[PDB]
Amino acid sequence: SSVEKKTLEEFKEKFNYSEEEKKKTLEEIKNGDGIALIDIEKIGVHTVIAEGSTLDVLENNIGHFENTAMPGENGNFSIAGHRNTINNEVFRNIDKLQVGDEIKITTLTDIFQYEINEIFVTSPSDTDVLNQNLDEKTMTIVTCTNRGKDRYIVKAKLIG
């Protein structure tokens, strides 16, 4: 969209940074900065993930929950695809994803492939979806469902 494209283009430009420059931007990250690309072939999602899950971030971008793992790390890299009761239109077709579909996450240094292994509906107060189990490498997408009343959760495990 507007800010989305910008965040997206600014991040892609950093692929041409050197390694210390990349590492330096790792530290220094601020809410609203691009941190990864996300591609989900099954539903035509090809965009960027911003840091943070505040209302301000989520108005323009898919956002990374602050205290969750980063892509490829032990724990559960968690992303928010709604702002209050409104899904980012980028996830309008998330209900088409199935167990076994792939989610590709590209940081400045690596391509991580996650495979969906759990889909479920829960409440807005179910904070456990953001839990960090450091014995595994997983990711989570949180959007809304049921006229904004419930949360639609997609979880995926790192495969490559």
Residue numbers in the entry: 28 to 187
Question: Which sentences from the paper describe this structure?
Answer:
The assembly and anchorage of various pathogenic proteins on the surface of Gram-positive bacteria is mediated by the sortase family of enzymes. These cysteine transpeptidases catalyze a unique sorting signal motif located at the C-terminus of their target substrate and promote the covalent attachment of these proteins onto an amino nucleophile located on another protein or on the bacterial cell wall. Less is known about the members of the class D family of sortases (SrtD), but they have a suggested role in spore formation in an oxygen-limiting environment. In the current study, we present the crystal structure of a C. perfringens transpeptidase which belongs to the class D family of sortases, suggesting a potential role of this enzyme in C. perfringens spore formation.
Recombinant C. perfringens sortase crystallized in space group P21 with two molecules in the crystallographic asymmetric unit. The final maps derived from the X-ray data showed clear density for 160 residues (28–187), only lacking the first five residues along with the N-terminal hexahistidine tag and thrombin cleavage site. Alignment of the two monomers revealed a r.m.s.d. value of less than 0.53 Å, with a slight conformational difference of the turn within the α1–α2 helix–turn–helix structure. Each monomer displayed the typical eight β-strands that form a β-barrel structure. Previous studies have demonstrated that the presence of both histidine and arginine are necessary for efficient catalysis by the conserved cysteine residue. These key residues are also present on the surface of C. perfringens sortase, with the catalytic cysteine located within the β7 strand at position 171. The most notable difference is the presence of N-terminal α-helices in C. perfringens SrtD which are absent in the B. anthracis SrtD structure. While the environment of the catalytic cleft in CpSrtD is equally rich in hydrophobic residues for substrate binding, it is relatively narrow owing to the position of a small helix within the β6–β7 loop when compared with SaSrtA. Overall, the C. perfringens sortase D reported in this study is structurally and catalytically distinct from the previously reported class D enzyme isolated from B. anthracis, suggesting that CpSrtD may represent a new subclass of the sortase D family.
